[PDB]
Structure formats: structure tokens, C-alpha cells
């Protein structure tokens, strides 16, 4: 029993109307099992969801290795979230530990310039002020601990008309089912 | 770097049943080995009594990782807390697992407590209840260990409507320092 455990909770969708102001409601808890220090990076990724797509496919395995060939050029081509170039936002923490919990170890933070996009100080939730159809899409919140993904989740933030179900393409389960 | 094993679990938080019904849990568990290291895995089911006088059950999340700590062995929340255990309802063990010899294939042992109407869903981690009765009502936790360390866990309150009590997860403050 060592390392860190990260648990994330959040609804898989947020339907909004044009002109509405809202915030994501992601809950993230970090449990340090030893007295080792650790770094943490909470990263937001955004993906366009084409009208022609019946659903958006998230290549789970690709999240850990977004530089792989099959990830850079997803077979489901237009309807797949398997890699990224720019990160919508990133909140970094350094020197975290059992006695110096995440809030206190806050270090740096970055956010891409997007109309109406913002976040509270020391917060990882995203706020959309005066939202519009331009903001609709698939958003992933990925939590790294010591540069390795420890937890992740997806939220389809969209107007009802633009909404498309997000499906997680994962490897076979422990029962060998796909 | 990217190493070790990642376990993801999904399941509804409650199953309401009427006496005499036959049903099964529907837990989904995926394991992703990021390297070629060999590992062991244990899928453990824990069952907790839910007293009629409890307003709600409280799960001490941090305690699941160290069930032998004093505050976990003697939970402050009367008999309405899930924070430690002795007997394990069921355990499916896997050995010699790896990226190329994934879980189903590395299945090794399976154990289950003798309980009227309870059975291991053949080749599955789910629990099946036949001719379910009030005796089966309670708070169930499914915990997945990898190399003897919890990598994922979930809870399911399985019971009749009359015996049902909401289960709340008591967690430390979040990364924003708000709990």
C-alpha cells in the first residue's frame, strides 16, 4: 500500500442553453498512502463533435499513450477522441503529500483564451459565462500524479440539439467481455 | 512515467429487490496493465449489516486502505459504519497476471461464504441472488486489489424497500480543500 489514489466523480453530461452561465461540478479526491511527495496536474481537453457523428468514441487506451500511431490517426477518424495537441486548461501542483495536501501544494495554472471560459482561483472546475453553441463538445478531465494518469472522466457539455452520446472504447473487461 | 496497473469500476449504487426475486449485480471492471510486470489481483466482496435504527450507512473511504487503524477498527458512527471487516463474503483471485496474460486468463482461485441463495455468477465477478429474502439486504462493497493494494472499489446497497438505508461516502476534503 503505497503511492497515491485519485478518485473523480462527475455527471457525464451537462446540457446548456445559449446565454446560460454554468460551471462543471467535478469532484476530485487525492489520498496519499505514504509520506512520499508527489506532483499532480489536472488537465482539461476539449474535442469537437461533428453533427454527422452518431456518437463520439473515446479511445481509453490512447489517453495513456496519445502519441501512438493508431491514436494520432483514429480509425473512427472524425468521431473519436484519442489524441490532442493543445490542452484547454491545466492546474499544476508540486510538493504535495499527506501533510501538504493538494490545495496547499498548488503551483502553476494555465488556460487557453476562450470566449466566456474561466475558473475560480485554486479551482479545477470550468465556468462558461454566456455560453453559446460554440462551446458544445466533449470535455475530458484528466488527473496526473507524478506524470502518470491516475484518474480521468468525460463530460459532454453541449446544447441539446448538438448533443451526441460519448462512448468509451475500452479493452476487454476482466471477464474477457467486449 | 506510465507504469503499473489501472483498474476502473462501474456499477449502480443500489439494487432494490422484492422477496422471491432472482437477480444479479452488474458490476463492470476493466484492468489496463501499462507495463509487462507480473501482478496478482483479488476481487473482494464485503457485506455490511444495516441496522433498522440507522438513518444511513457511512462508508469511511480512507479506512478501506488501512482497516486496521484504531479509528477504523472502532468506527465512531455507531453500528452504521463500513470501515473495517473480518470475514470476506467472496473473493476471486488471479495470479501470474500481465499485459499479455490478462485477468480472465490468470484466474486462479475463488471463495465464497456459505449463504442461502448466494452464488458466484459462473466465470463472473458478479453476485447472484436466488429466491432473494430480507436476509440478503445490506451494504455490499466490491474492492479490487492489485498486488495487495486497493486499485478500485464501489458500493451497492442491495435490499428490500423497507430495509433500504441510503449509503453515504465519508471522504477527506477534495483537492480544492472543500468537504
Residue numbers in the entry:
A (entry chain B): 219 to 396
B (entry chain A): 218 to 396
Published text:
HSV-1 gE-gI is a heterodimer composed of two type I membrane glycoproteins: gE, a 530-residue protein including a ˜401-residue extracellular region followed by a predicted single transmembrane helix and a ˜106-residue C-terminal cytoplasmic tail; and gI, a 370-residue protein including a ˜248-residue extracellular portion followed by a predicted single transmembrane helix, and a ˜94-residue C-terminal cytoplasmic tail.
Here we identify the C-terminal domain of the gE ectodomain (CgE) as the minimal Fc-binding domain and present a 1.78-Å CgE structure. The CgE fold lacks the disulfide bond that joins the A′GFCC′C′′ and the DEBB′A sheets in the canonical Ig fold, with CgE containing a cysteine in strand F (Cys359) but a valine in the complementary position in strand B (Val244). Differences between the pIgR and CgE Ig V folds include the positions of the CDR loops, the predicted Fc-binding sites (described for CgE below), the overall size, with CgE being larger due to its extended strands C, C′, and C′′, and the third β-sheet in CgE, which is absent in pIgR domain 1. However, the structures of CgE and a gE-gI/Fc complex reported here can be used to identify which insertions are likely to disrupt the CgE structure and which insertions are likely to affect function.
